[PDB]
Scaffold this active site. Sequence first.
Site, PDB file in Angstrom:
ATOM      1  N   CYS B  90     -12.374  20.448   4.025  1.00  0.00           N
ATOM      2  CA  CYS B  90     -12.097  20.289   5.439  1.00  0.00           C
ATOM      3  C   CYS B  90     -13.195  19.597   6.211  1.00  0.00           C
ATOM      4  O   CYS B  90     -12.899  18.965   7.227  1.00  0.00           O
ATOM      5  N   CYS B 404     -15.780  25.138  10.033  1.00  0.00           N
ATOM      6  CA  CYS B 404     -15.417  25.997   8.919  1.00  0.00           C
ATOM      7  C   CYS B 404     -14.510  25.215   7.995  1.00  0.00           C
ATOM      8  O   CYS B 404     -13.785  24.329   8.447  1.00  0.00           O
TER       9      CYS B 404
END
EC number: 2.3.1.155
Lengths: 711, 420, 420
Positions: B90, B404
């Site tokens: 990500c 995150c």
Amino acid sequence: TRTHINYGVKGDVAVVRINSPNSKVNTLSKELHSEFSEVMNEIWASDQIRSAVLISSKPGCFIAGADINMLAACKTLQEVTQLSQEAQRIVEKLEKSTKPIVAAINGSCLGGGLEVAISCQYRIATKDRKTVLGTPEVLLGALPGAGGTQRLPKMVGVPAALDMMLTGRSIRADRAKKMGLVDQLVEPLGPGLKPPEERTIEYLEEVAITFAKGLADKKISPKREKLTAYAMTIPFVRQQVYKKVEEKVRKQTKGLYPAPLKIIDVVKTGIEQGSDAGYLCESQKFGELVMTKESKALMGLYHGQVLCKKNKFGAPQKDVKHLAILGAGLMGAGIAQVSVDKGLKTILKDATLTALDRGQQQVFKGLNDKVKKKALTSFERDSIFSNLTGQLDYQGFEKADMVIEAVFEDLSLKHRVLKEVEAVIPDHCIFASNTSALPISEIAAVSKRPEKVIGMHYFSPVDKMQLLEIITTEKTSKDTSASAVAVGLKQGKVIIVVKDGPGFYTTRCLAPMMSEVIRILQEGVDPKKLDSLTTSFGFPVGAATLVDEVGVDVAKHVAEDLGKVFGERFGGGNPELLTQMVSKGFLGRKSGKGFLNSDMDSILASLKLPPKSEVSSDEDIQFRLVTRFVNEAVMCLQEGILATPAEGDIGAVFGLGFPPCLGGPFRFVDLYGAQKIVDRLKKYEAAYGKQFTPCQLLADHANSPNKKFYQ
Amino acid sequence: PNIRNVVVVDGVRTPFLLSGTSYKDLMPHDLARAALTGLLHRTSVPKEVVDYIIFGTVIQEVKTSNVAREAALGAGFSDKTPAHTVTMACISANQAMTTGVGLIASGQCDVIVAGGVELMSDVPIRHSRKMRKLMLDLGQRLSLISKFRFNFLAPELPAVSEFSTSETMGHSADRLAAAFAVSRLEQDEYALRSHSLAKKAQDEGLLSDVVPFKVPGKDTVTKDNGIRPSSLEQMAKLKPAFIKPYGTVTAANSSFLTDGASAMLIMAEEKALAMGYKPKAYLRDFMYVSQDPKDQLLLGPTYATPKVLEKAGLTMNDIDAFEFHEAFSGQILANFKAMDSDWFAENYMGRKTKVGLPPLEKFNNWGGSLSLGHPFGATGCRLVMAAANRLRKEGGQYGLVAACAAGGQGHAMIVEAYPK
Amino acid sequence: PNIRNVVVVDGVRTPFLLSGTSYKDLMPHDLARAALTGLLHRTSVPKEVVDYIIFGTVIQEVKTSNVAREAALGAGFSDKTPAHTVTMACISANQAMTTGVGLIASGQCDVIVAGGVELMSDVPIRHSRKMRKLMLDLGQRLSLISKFRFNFLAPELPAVSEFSTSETMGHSADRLAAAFAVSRLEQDEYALRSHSLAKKAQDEGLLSDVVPFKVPGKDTVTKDNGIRPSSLEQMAKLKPAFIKPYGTVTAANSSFLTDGASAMLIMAEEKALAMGYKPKAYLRDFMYVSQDPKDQLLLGPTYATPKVLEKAGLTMNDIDAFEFHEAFSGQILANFKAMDSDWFAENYMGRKTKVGLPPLEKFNNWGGSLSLGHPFGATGCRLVMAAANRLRKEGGQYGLVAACAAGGQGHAMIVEAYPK
């Protein structure tokens, strides 16, 4: 008052909680219902609260089954049926309340807890490995704590749970949705503002209360493709299902379990007859099969089953994390197959590469079937496999702290093998060995350290059977023994500690049974018949399969080992012919086919050894082999094989092959009586006078002055 | 204090479109080329000075591997410029900038392009594990390979489940959401904010890190699409999809499948002052840590931030402008709730108290994720200019960006204001 | 001279198997786990000290992206260790070590694992560009998406063609081979060498950078398979496959589809002397350059080497042990032939003469590529230990490793002997 159960008001919802701080786990008892009664009536005497929810606020299991020392609390038949008729009257109180209720499951709910669970309108469960849902009913041999079997097949179905309630085995919470007992799942949580498991038991309260208000005003309904084919369809196939099961139960086991068919007659009569009238048939049944000689000692088997899953030696000091398995093969790769998954680093020694292929293809092949039955994830499988490295020579034993030998048994080569694999190992280690025949005190006087050597003997298919045995010298320290049994119970397999002797315990009792396995075909009674003859008495595997179980090569050594000392007079007592069996070179299980084989007959008709004559029917030779087996099993502790012999056949029935629904060889002085077996061998008194001679300690309190061992 | 400094220059971002609109025609190295040409449109840099471009995907369209090589050759770069991709879950881009700043501070090269490019419109649905054994086909052996066959044709799916625990993003999302006492009403105040600020941000029109380009198949231009405001009563009716209706994550306050790209330029300071471009920011320290994907799956940023504050040598409350990345509503307020109390820094490291106290005022004002979508591997290389032009716009001089990732990795790095 | 140094420690390589043998059962993150556990078998390092592992693939098996994360979690690492993959064409690993040494010399972390892992056995054959629009399927709209259909089912193939010029490896291979006056006889003296040395190398058995592991499906163990010696007369009969029979590249003296993995450990020198492991090598400078993929496609190394010799400040002939990577026979002798003359450094840079003179004696003696196969993204992280243990074995102290990549990128870095 509120000693174990309590609630409060939040959301105007009664959060009744279950706890019992005395024991570690909570048990259904008279001492719990004695206050569980006068709470729900007050719930039924209220009007502000419109929904309620019960939960076990203690972490761990939900509740127990029948409390082990309360159904085994000895009482007469009318009272044991009165309690087991009252025990479901309190369930038929709450199962159809006007005010609906919701239960919850966050533990190993077992036994009568399903009685509490499925009587509710709507239960809710936590998807993890710790919560399991099983019915220990036939495993101790009874019918359940309040007779939930008259609304299980109303709920999930006759053929669906008919392979559940008497298979004994539990189900995890994942298949219970596809089965249909519990309907909604919720996975647990990790980190919290409170410690990472106390919130998960306090998380279900609010999911329950958000289900709960919806139940009062009916936004959700409790009316939640193979069973739907069955769901209305039994007008005529009635006999043509439970007949298929009637011969199923006697093809799986044999017919000398009078326990489990006595729950079939419930579900045989629960269908087609008075259902509410059917709730009193088992009142005339539960008192029968609990007050019988089938499972009376089965409670003591369970007391020992829980009693030896305990550390029992102080506190564990300096726990192990690494292993060292000297030798591949069938034990080494075998015990690696079980000692690898639950967090033990292992190193598997071999001689050449040529046997590691036979090595890891156990610890892999007996592993991915585990993921083929969806009991593990596909990923964690392979980390479990990669905890096991296989060295070739020695590079890495400086990090090891516990060593287990696995080489094929010899007194001479291992005597050296312990002397070259002593130097590259630290001093706070443990040496151990899985010998089967020769004792350790003969080899405990060689090494540099005298006190850091114990023994651990396993049994041969390591996955299915479920116990170890410990070999303890004079010189075993308490820390050594505790560190050993830490591996024993962290392994998970139920331990027994044994102070040693020439021939320790299990082969020590098996060879005086195996030495008469030749004695039936010593006359020639077609030992294919003997398989049926001995499985009829209760042994799960035939004595032919027992000699095809042990391996034909070690049979001569376990004939010669105690025959070196005293096996010729009463650790045996028949002419050995297994060397003539291997003289042709028969290979046993590795030859695939067992024994007609057309060559056992030439042994007996070599020279005419059986002109023998005695009235020895099938029952006669069954009790001959069993009475000699228990003569040896009562010979132990006469020399003090251990501290107290009530710890005994927790071992000797559970891997040796002794039948359950027979209480144990240390348990035939009680329901069969020492008086009756001494009349059996006193019927057999003039046969030989040498080998079957009874021991002295059991015989003096045997017949007249009504004495028992401890009861 | 003698390490060479490092500089962000103007950060082009092609706008993010919800999947199903005009990027359902494209080819997963093409808007890479669009974003990179847009970078070469407003930078006026000679195309031979740009040294070492690095991109980052997550999908890796396998007809053309190592996206950055031909994606720089497509925009007419001088081809004496080596390139590679960097694939994480990500924070792929915003792993690009940190390996670039490592490449610069080693003291061997000149300038870096860092970008993140993906399209979740055409996910790779691959054929099977065992039908591809018919690659052995490519005159009787051609028959005998085809001889063994039953019906085992099934396209296996790239179910985004992180594979270490075999469960999707949303299960771990609402687990961590419910575990830190987040009500449904408190979880959607933030959902209201992350659109209410976004529509005003596009209304004033100073979010000017956007180039347009034309999609070659469909009609005209692009501009961001994921912005819609609503009321709180028109949100709680949306029944949640990731779990049975007791849970608390629905598709309204959650990320959506969107596509897009981004790029920037990273310069050494001495050539930035020698050539004469007006910079935007420095790029100081960076901690880079991971979390065990059984418990703290999406506890990404707030296990990493007090490891970078002590790394730089400063304090929390005297930062000037955060922006934390989101992937779910509530997650970011669980990354508010947990560290505004004890017991969590306790027992997961030793002896701190309240080292996360973000005062919520200096938070995501130019709306972060959930505002204009969350591309799966291109956020971050939005976020740095959304820190930089932001903290230039008001006062202040420092500010941390933290994100995150699907798999336990976090990211956190502080960004300083313009050197004038 | 005040930059922190950096150290290679013992370099585990699982052996390379020609495709069709026991690695046709595996799963493209599993022998990653095997090579990494083998690294943790001979290093005795506590598993919590290893800081930041980075791998590199080329295929990116998309059921599990970012291979290194779960491939470190699978081998039981402590999961406070962030990871990423780095994908290039051919020198993916040996782009891993250079971003690792950049990560170390920045002065923030401790130790690096660098590895390269791939399997060309299961190439990704993906479904189509337009059948995957049936992802819109996942009660009348389910019909109307299925309503438009003709016969357009065709699995498009990952034809390895570099996409910038739409032609395979072999066309550019024999182009550059024939362009520098390479006869068929001269092109296969080297093919004879690159097996004749290899069989002797396995015969003495000191190529000891090999762990075995067991393939879980098939029988026993592994050891390298691509080694076969033959005579020159038994090679010219092999009719060439990459072009019509006038050309000069056949499958005998050419790379083959093989599978395998590799890893190592990279340590800071001060903790290498504080903990006390005996190192192998330093890891000095690294040039990293690309070539325009129309002309000099596989002129990889020898446009990069005189840019790293002047970078380090030394001379060509006083190196002690090369090893150049190959991907085709002849290519490496064209990378001998071209720079043993003028006119090519001329007109492609300014004013050098003969800056490549490798004397052929200190060349690939422990047989490089074509000996034990060429994995597509894992060579290089063989090659460093094959430089290190090699130049320890004889005398000498320096040596360059250089490799060519599918797309024009080169790689070249010098490796010094053991610090004792």
